[PDB]
Amino acid sequence: LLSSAYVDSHKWEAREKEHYCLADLASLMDKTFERKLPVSSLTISRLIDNISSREEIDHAEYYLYKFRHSPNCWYLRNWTIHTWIRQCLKYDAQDKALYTLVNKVQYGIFPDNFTFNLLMDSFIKKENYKDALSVVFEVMMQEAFEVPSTQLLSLYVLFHCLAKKTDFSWEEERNFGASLLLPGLKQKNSVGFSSQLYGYALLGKVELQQGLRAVYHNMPLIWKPGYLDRALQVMEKVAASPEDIKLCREALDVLGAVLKALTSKLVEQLDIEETEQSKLPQYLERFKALHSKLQALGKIESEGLLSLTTQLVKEKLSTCEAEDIATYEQNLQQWHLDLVQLIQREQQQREQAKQEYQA
Amino acid sequence: VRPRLIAELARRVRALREQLNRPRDSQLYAVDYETLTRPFSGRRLPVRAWADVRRESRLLQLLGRLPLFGLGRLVTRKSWLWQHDEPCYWRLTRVRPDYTAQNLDHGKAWGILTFKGKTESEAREIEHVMYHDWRLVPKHEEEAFTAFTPAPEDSLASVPYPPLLRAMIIAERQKNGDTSTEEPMLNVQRIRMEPWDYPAKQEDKGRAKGT
Amino acid sequence: KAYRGGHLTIRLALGGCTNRPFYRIVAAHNKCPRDGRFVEQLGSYDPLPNSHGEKLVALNLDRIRHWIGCGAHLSKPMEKLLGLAGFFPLHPMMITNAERLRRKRAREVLLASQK
């Protein structure tokens, strides 16, 4: 879905690179780890920069693991992560990039939005929507929906996957609900509000059937009950919204199906508060009333979610890509400056050590 | 006095061996969830914590899944959420992960504390980092989570003296010629009763010794 | 003698004989034995009623105030005794135990009425 200019690798190929043999840097890091001493971020940056084969990706994965479990794990630089993902894409190793992204705790791979988009678009271009969905879920887990391009791409992938899904595990429901709620909240259009309602419906089904802890545990979600009430609040907000804002019929149908299926361990809530299972009937009544209201005002969209998202993408992704490319240009320049500063510090320290030793 | 040099040697050697064989957080604060005992010492945890130990997450179990170990993010605690209605949280400023942990789920943290809606001026070390009591505030919820309107905190400005002490004060005044009819009064404006669950100074806290 | 840490506390040292207790209010190091070395004797307490049906308590209020101002702690029975004297507020546990006794006797009276 992204243009050739966005995914072009020429300018990262053109970065100033100081060449080393990966074996030498690997041996130096091995000796440093044997001595129980900290390895510099510059060393791992050089190691990742000098991947020249698919087997060197296997070696660099191990050394990324080792650096993550070292005293200077915090100092892994952003350009190193970007270069790792670039190398993985270059040498047909998207599986390794996805493995390191999924196990980000063990490898410290926390990409920026541009790198998420690169990986997601590679998977989309190769029609591997399962791995694209995995990347979208990883974006959700890191709460990296701060850039419009990532939001649009994730919404497209999520709706494409949902259009062909019937059997839902509650873990899958939770993941889909979070991954559609987070980008939907940042888009003030019909697609965004429909995504909000759909995700709230899914999360509310999970809350009612499996409990609220199943919803908020290890997720970027709040620990307050009332997700179905929040869906109904989205409906009410759309009722008082400007004309252009509408709601897809599919999202409303999903919410209705959830409510119709719901109306047919430690206690976390205060006993004085009314439980959601006791509020299901009034939720159903409110849903019916608000559905009739929205139908009356003509605030219901008949186009499917996937088609609407496709149209919105074709309308906005070009400008989003332009902005992202400019930010990427700026980031590359700043990364070059920082790397040169690190190299200078390392060289100054070595020469000073030499003037110490000559005495 | 006949010098005791073996004592000097023993103390120095023990100090060196304790400084070089330090047990790490991953070893000290590991827990066997089936028996809820510490493998390092074998001591079982108190009963009232058991459920939490099996349900909630340690702070760095959350931070190790975030970029930069979640610097600048807001982290709250389950116990604070249950006990207090006003917002309580830490704004992280510095994190020192325990690299020896497989999942990087042990370590130390520093931040700015806000307790019951009152923010502190400086950043200090966070206590109970290893407790299974921690929750991460979502970014899209922070604005709603941090919202707080400071209610009027008007408490008693003074209290009566105890009966006998009041009588003694009045008797002393009358003996010294004072005939004032004003009641003796104890000022309690300078006594701020801090809630027992407020974070203490982790910098002053000790550490389990290696054995 | 040097104790590792510790602090001064005003407490009751038990003397007398078997089945006849008597207490000396003393300010002493918390680590010292109950009836051992003390810094100063600050009073006395006879818990057995005398021929007049009275429990006699002697309190050196000046020295008690001095030692409290010097950083001395207080044992819980001393807090209760000083609350009874009116020198301190009544300790919360005296109030709570009084309420518990009231409820227990109310239950007993209700049992009698039910019978």
Partner: peptide
């Protein structure tokens, strides 16, 4: 106590509660 605080305590001490005590007798029962 307010009802909300009592409910908070009941949640805090789930499964380890006694019967709630009302106001005590005003005078000492005879």
């Amino acid at each position: 106590p307010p009802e909300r605080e009592l409910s908070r305590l009941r949640r805090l001490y789930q499964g380890h509660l006694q019967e709630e005590s009302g106001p005590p007798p005003e005078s000492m029962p005879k």
